[PDB]
Design a protein around this ligand. Structure first.
Ligand SMILES: N[C@@H](CCSC(F)F)C(=O)O
Ligand SMILES: [Zn+2]
Length: 547
C-alpha cells in the first residue's frame, strides 16, 4: 500500500473562500478520494496561511488581536470546505507551535549549512506609525500623468509602472504621514546555490510540461537570493538571535504543510509517521496541488529549502489554471465573484464538484464556469443520465417485487463492458485526466440508458405474465447504476451516500465485480433534482448585492 501525503495551497486568513479556491480543493479532494478507494494510506493536509503585514494591519483596523481575527477566519474557511465535503485528515494553521519549531529548525539548518546571508537594504518607512511600508501601503501622485491617489508601483489611470519611491508627495496608507527611506539588515536565502539541482528536477519529466517550460524562463532570467526577513512590527515568527526580525510569511508558509502533518501525527499519538514522510530516505509520496501564481515558490524556493535542511522534496507538483465565470475573470460588478458560502445558499456541493471535474485535465489551462452550461450539464448528466437509471427502475422493484433484485444479470455481456472500463477510468482519475474519466463514465451512462430504452420496461410492465422479465430489466438497470456511481464516488460524495442508502451497500472499487443479485434495495425520495436558470440568476444577484 502506497503512503501518500497530499496538500492544497494554504488559504490566506484575510479573505473568504471563493470559487477560485474551490476549484483547487475540489480537484485535490477528487484525487484523494480515488486514492483512498484504491486502498492507499492517504493523508490530505491543509491549513490557513495566517502571517503577514496585511493580516496584522487588518486586525488593527477591526480593533481585535490578529489571533482573534485569524481564529474567526479559520473557522469560516473550515465551515465552507466542510460544506463542499473536502475530506482533509487535518486542517491546521501556519500560526502554530508546530510551524514555529519547524521554521526555526529549518532556518537553523540553512544557516548552519551556509545558505543564509546578511544584507542591508533601503526601504520606505513610516516614521509616525514606525513601520516599513510594503509597496501596496504607499500612495501618492503618479510621476507620469500626475494623477492623485495612486497605490503601489503602478498608476490605474495612465497605467505607468514605477518604484513607489518615484511617487509624488508620498503618503502612508496606514497613518497618512510622509514616508522616508530607511536602512535595515535583512536575511537572504541563497537560492542560486541550488540552481543545478533545480534544473535537473525540471528536466526529469515529473512536472507538467507547461510548468517545466515556465521554469526554463525563470532560470534564463536568473535565480536571485531571496529576502526572508521582515522588521517589526509584524505578525509572524521571530528569528532566533535576531531581535526585532521576523520570518517573511512565504518562508514559514510552506513549512506549514509540515506543521500541519506534525500536528496530525501528534494528535494521533503517532511518533513515527512524521519522519517516515519527511526524512530524506522516505518511501512515501508527497504531492502539492497549487495554482499557477504560486509555482515559483513551490518549484524553486521550497525544494531548495527542503534540500538545504535535510528533508525530502515534493514527488510532484500538480498545477491548475485560473477559474473564470462566463469566460471572464470573476467580476464583482457582474456578480460573478462568488463566495463558497454564497454558492451553497443556492446549489449543492455535488453540482459544482461535478462541473469542475468534467472540465478538469492534467494541464494548467483555465477552467471556465459558464453558468448557462452549468445548468444544462448538471441536468443532462446527473439527473437525466445517471440518476435516471435508478429512478426509472427502482419504482417497479419496490412496488412489484418487494424491493428484491433479480437473482441473475439479464445482460452479462453488457455488465462486463461496464466493469471492463474500470482500468481506463481509474487510470484517468489517477493521471488527473478528470474530463476524460467523466466522458468515459457518461459514455457508459448512454449505453445503460440505451439498454433500458431497448427493453422498454414501461411497456413490459403492462403486459401480462412478463413479471419476471420486468424484474430482470429493472435489476439490470440498477446494477449498471451501481457501477456508474462507483466510478463517480470520488466526484459526488453526497449523491454517493444517498445511492449507498438506496442500494443497501457501500460502494467499493473492486465490489463492482460482484453484481447485486437476490438483493434488497430501499425506497428513496428524489436522489437529485433538476436546477434552473432562475437559481443562477438569484446566485448572481445575491453576489452583486454582497460587494
Ligand atoms: N496563501 C498563499 C498560498 C500559500 S501555499 C504554502 F506555501 F503555504 C496564497 O494564497 O497564495
Ligand atoms: Zn499615471
Amino acid at each position: 500500500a502506497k503512503k501518500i501525503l497530499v496538500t492544497c495551497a494554504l488559504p490566506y486568513a484575510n479573505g473568504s473562500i471563493h470559487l477560485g479556491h474551490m476549484l483547487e480543493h475540489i480537484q485535490a479532494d477528487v484525487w484523494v478520494r480515488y486514492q483512498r478507494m484504491r486502498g492507499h494510506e492517504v493523508n490530505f493536509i491543509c491549513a490557513d496561511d495566517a502571517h503577514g503585514t496585511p493580516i496584522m494591519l487588518k486586525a488593527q483596523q477591526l480593533g481585535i488581536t490578529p489571533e482573534q481575527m485569524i481564529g474567526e477566519m479559520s473557522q469560516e474557511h473550515q465551515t465552507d470546505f466542510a460544506g463542499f465535503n473536502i475530506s482533509y485528515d487535518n486542517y491546521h494553521s501556519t500560526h502554530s507551535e508546530e510551524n514555529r519549531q519547524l521554521s526555526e529548525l529549518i532556518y537553523s539548518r540553512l544557516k548552519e549549512n551556509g545558505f543564509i546571508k546578511n544584507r542591508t537594504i533601503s526601504q520606505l518607512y513610516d516614521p509616525e506609525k514606525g513601520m516599513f511600508l510594503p509597496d501596496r501601503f504607499v500612495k501618492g501622485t503618479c510621476p507620469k500623468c500626475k494623477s492623485p491617489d495612486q497605490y503601489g508601483d503602478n498608476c490605474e489611470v495612465c497605467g505607468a509602472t514605477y518604484s513607489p519611491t518615484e511617487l509624488i508627495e508620498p503618503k502612508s496608507v496606514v497613518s497618512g504621514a510622509t514616508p522616508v527611506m530607511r536602512d535595515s539588515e535583512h536575511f537572504f536565502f541563497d537560492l542560486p546555490s541550488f540552481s543545478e539541482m533545480l534544473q535537473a528536477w525540471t528536466r526529469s519529466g515529473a512536472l507538467q510540461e507547461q510548468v517545466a517550460n515556465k521554469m526554463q524562463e525563470w532560470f534564463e532570467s536568473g535565480l536571485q537570493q531571496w529576502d526572508i526577513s521582515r522588521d517589526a512590527p509584524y505578525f509572524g515568527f521571530e528569528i532566533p538571535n535576531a531581535p526585532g526580525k521576523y520570518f517573511y510569511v512565504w518562508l514559514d508558509a510552506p513549512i506549514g504543510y509540515m506543521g500541519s502533518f506534525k500536528n496530525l501525527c501528534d494528535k494521533r499519538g503517532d511518533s513515527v509517521s512524521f519522519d517516515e514522510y519527511w526524512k530524506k530516505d522516505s518511501t512515501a509520496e508527497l504531492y502539492h496541488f497549487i495554482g499557477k501564481d504560486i509555482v515559483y515558490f513551490h518549484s524553486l524556493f521550497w525544494p531548495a529549502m527542503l534540500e538545504g535542511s535535510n528533508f525530502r522534496k515534493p514527488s510532484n507538483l500538480f498545477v491548475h489554471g485560473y477559474v473564470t465565470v462566463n469566460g471572464a475573470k470573476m467580476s464583482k460588478s457582474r456578480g460573478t465573484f462568488i463566495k463558497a458560502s454564497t454558492w451553497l445558499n443556492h446549489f449543492d456541493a455535488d453540482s459544482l464538484r461535478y462541473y469542475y471535474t468534467a472540465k478538469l485535465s492534467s494541464r494548467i489551462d483555465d477552467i471556465d464556469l459558464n453558468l448557462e452550461d452549468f445548468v444544462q450539464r448538471v441536468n443532462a448528466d446527473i439527473v437525466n443520465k445517471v440518476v435516471n437509471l435508478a429512478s426509472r427502475n427502482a419504482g417497479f422493484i419496490n412496488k412489484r417485487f418487494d424491493g428484491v433484485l433479480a437473482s441473475e444479470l439479464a445482460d452479462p455481456q453488457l455488465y462486463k463492458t461496464f466493469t471492463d472500463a474500470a482500468e481506463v477510468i481509474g487510470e484517468a482519475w489517477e493521471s488527473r485526466e478528470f474530463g476524460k474519466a467523466v466522458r468515459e463514465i457518461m459514455a457508459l451512462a448512454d449505453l445503460a440508458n440505451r439498454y433500458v430504452d431497448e427493453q422498454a420496461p414501461w411497456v413490459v410492465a403492462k403486459q401480462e405474465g412478463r413479471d419476471a422479465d420486468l424484474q430482470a430489466i429493472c435489476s439490470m438497470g440498477i446494477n449498471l447504476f451501481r457501477v456508474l456511481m462507483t466510478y463517480l464516488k470520488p466526484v459526488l460524495p453526497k449523491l454517493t451516500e444517498r445511492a449507498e442508502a438506496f442500494l443497501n451497500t457501500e460502494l467499493t472499487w473492486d465490489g463492482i465485480q460482484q453484481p447485486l443479485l437476490g438483493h434488497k434495495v430501499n425506497p428513496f425520495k428524489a436522489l437529485y433534482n433538476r436546477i434552473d436558470m432562475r437559481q443562477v440568476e438569484a446566485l448572481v444577484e445575491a453576489s452583486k448585492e454582497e460587494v
